[PDB]
Scaffold this motif. Structure first.
Motif, PDB file in Angstrom:
ATOM      1  N   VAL A  84      34.128  38.446  32.601  1.00  0.00           N
ATOM      2  CA  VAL A  84      33.639  39.502  33.471  1.00  0.00           C
ATOM      3  C   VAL A  84      34.369  40.802  33.147  1.00  0.00           C
ATOM      4  N   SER A  85      33.836  41.918  33.622  1.00  0.00           N
ATOM      5  CA  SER A  85      34.538  43.182  33.486  1.00  0.00           C
ATOM      6  C   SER A  85      35.168  43.506  34.823  1.00  0.00           C
ATOM      7  N   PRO A  86      36.278  44.241  34.795  1.00  0.00           N
ATOM      8  CA  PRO A  86      36.912  44.685  36.047  1.00  0.00           C
ATOM      9  C   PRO A  86      36.162  45.877  36.647  1.00  0.00           C
ATOM     10  N   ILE A 145      43.159  47.593  30.627  1.00  0.00           N
ATOM     11  CA  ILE A 145      43.288  46.150  30.463  1.00  0.00           C
ATOM     12  C   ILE A 145      42.248  45.498  31.358  1.00  0.00           C
ATOM     13  N   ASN A 146      41.693  44.376  30.913  1.00  0.00           N
ATOM     14  CA  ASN A 146      40.734  43.655  31.732  1.00  0.00           C
ATOM     15  C   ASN A 146      41.463  42.848  32.801  1.00  0.00           C
ATOM     16  N   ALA A 147      41.726  43.504  33.929  1.00  0.00           N
ATOM     17  CA  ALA A 147      42.493  42.916  35.017  1.00  0.00           C
ATOM     18  C   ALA A 147      42.178  43.690  36.278  1.00  0.00           C
ATOM     19  N   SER A 148      42.184  42.983  37.409  1.00  0.00           N
ATOM     20  CA  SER A 148      41.799  43.557  38.692  1.00  0.00           C
ATOM     21  C   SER A 148      42.846  43.182  39.732  1.00  0.00           C
ATOM     22  N   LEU A 149      43.145  44.117  40.628  1.00  0.00           N
ATOM     23  CA  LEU A 149      43.992  43.842  41.781  1.00  0.00           C
ATOM     24  C   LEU A 149      43.149  43.406  42.971  1.00  0.00           C
ATOM     25  N   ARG A 189      36.859  41.817  42.336  1.00  0.00           N
ATOM     26  CA  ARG A 189      36.522  41.393  40.981  1.00  0.00           C
ATOM     27  C   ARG A 189      35.324  40.445  41.039  1.00  0.00           C
ATOM     28  N   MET A 190      34.451  40.519  40.036  1.00  0.00           N
ATOM     29  CA  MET A 190      33.304  39.612  39.938  1.00  0.00           C
ATOM     30  C   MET A 190      33.720  38.255  39.399  1.00  0.00           C
TER      31      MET A 190
END
Ligand SMILES: [Mg+2]
Length: 282
Positions: free
Chosen positions: A49-51, A67-71, A257-258
């Protein structure tokens, strides 16, 4: 438990796919414009998935902060998690940069490096004490300090050194090694034990930056970990534990995030984990 009453009802009528589909339909949709920029193409794991832009983690770099990362910030539970993709051959430096900048104490890995005969993430930590890793691009050194292999998970102590400042931090790597190649675990027992081991380490606690959680591209697991943790915490916190609705908590998390729960079977497993976890805790 009311949740267990609901669980049995869904099971009986076989409506897991329907419940899951309704959640999918209701789930948040936000832009991921940064993730989609051509210059970031090689920072994104295929099939991952994308953030969302609004919740993405920014690297502290002028050139490219992506970076591909989500809080995932759970306000009521007072828990935060960073959900990220398995590091790519070229983003391991970025990954550890994020761990450093976000002051994380723990990394939770919910996949094996090879699953289904295919590589699921780069070998991003050192496997022998005497063979440390240097990430030249982000100026970090990573050393394996100790490794404790148990039947269902492995915990590693790592030392992360910011070579720019010579500051060092201990990072705990919690590696769940027994998630099956197909489907979900038959019992949530080992997964719950694993979550409790992560909790006991302090890696989820407010004195540290958010734990960094990842799995394999596009197939969840990470969402189940955070969902279970938050639901269980809320059951301990609320005056009315029976008011904790896993669907509502999941939809809240999905704002950040998805792809948190990717199949109806994973949704069922998450219910199962919270139910069994609640029985253990209260
Ligand atoms: Mg040795």
């Amino acid at each position: 438990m009311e949740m267990e009453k609901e669980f049995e009802q869904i099971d009986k009528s076989g409506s897991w796919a329907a419940i899951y589909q309704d959640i999918r339909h209701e789930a948040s949709d936000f832009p991921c414009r940064v993730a989609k920029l051509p210059k970031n193409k090689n920072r994104n794991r295929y099939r991952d998935v994308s953030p969302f832009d609004h919740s993405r983690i920014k690297l502290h770099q002028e050139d490219n902060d992506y970076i591909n990362a989500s809080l995932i910030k759970m306000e009521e539970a007072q828990r935060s998690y960073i959900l990220t993709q398995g590091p790519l051959p070229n983003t391991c430096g970025h990954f550890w940069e994020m761990v450093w900048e976000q002051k994380s104490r723990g990394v939770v890995m919910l996949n094996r490096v090879m699953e289904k005969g295919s590589l699921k993430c780069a070998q991003y930590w050192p496997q022998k004490e005497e063979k440390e890793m240097i990430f030249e691009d982000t100026n970090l050194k990573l050393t394996l300090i100790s490794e404790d292999i148990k039947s269902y998970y492995t915990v590693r102590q790592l030392e992360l050194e910011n070579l720019t400042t010579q500051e060092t931090r201990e990072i705990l790597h919690f590696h769940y090694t027994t998630w099956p190649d197909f489907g979900v675990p038959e019992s949530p027992a080992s997964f719950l034990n694993f979550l409790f081991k992560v909790r006991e380490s302090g890696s989820l606690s407010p004195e540290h930056g958010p734990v960094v959680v990842h799995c394999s591209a596009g197939i969840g697991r990470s969402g189940t970990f955070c969902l279970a943790d938050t639901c269980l915490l809320l059951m301990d916190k609320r005056k009315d534990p029976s008011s904790v609705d896993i669907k509502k908590v999941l939809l809240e998390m999905r704002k950040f995030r998805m792809g948190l729960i990717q199949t109806a079977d994973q949704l069922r497993f998450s219910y199962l984990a919270v139910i069994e976890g609640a029985k253990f805790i209260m």
